[PDB]
Amino acid sequence: MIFPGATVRVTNVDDTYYRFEGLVQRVSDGKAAVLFENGNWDKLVTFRLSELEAVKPILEHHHHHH
Template sequence: MPDLPILPGTTVVVRDVRSIYNGYKGFVQRISGSRAAVLFEGGNWDKLVTMPLTTLEQI
């Protein structure tokens, strides 16, 4: 079965060993070109980070 496209609202995990966000789970907020804005929430903080779609894996 082919991978489904990553769309806004998709839950993703970061798969990039060079990123400090490697292994973090978040929600895609918007997509622009080959990059996605991903919202990470944790305890008492929220962070919106833009990263390449190639480093994201849908879960």
């Protein structure tokens, strides 16, 4: 499952953003709008969910207890 706010990588080899990582901004008619950001430069490009794979977020320490 992927949601707006999840980090994704473009795994489509015939694309310019292959291997590059972006942030899903929104779901658009079954697709996902991926935002690429470099500290000023950006370009929001919508891809398919099939076109993306989910990357790992920051390493938080999750814990629960009973």
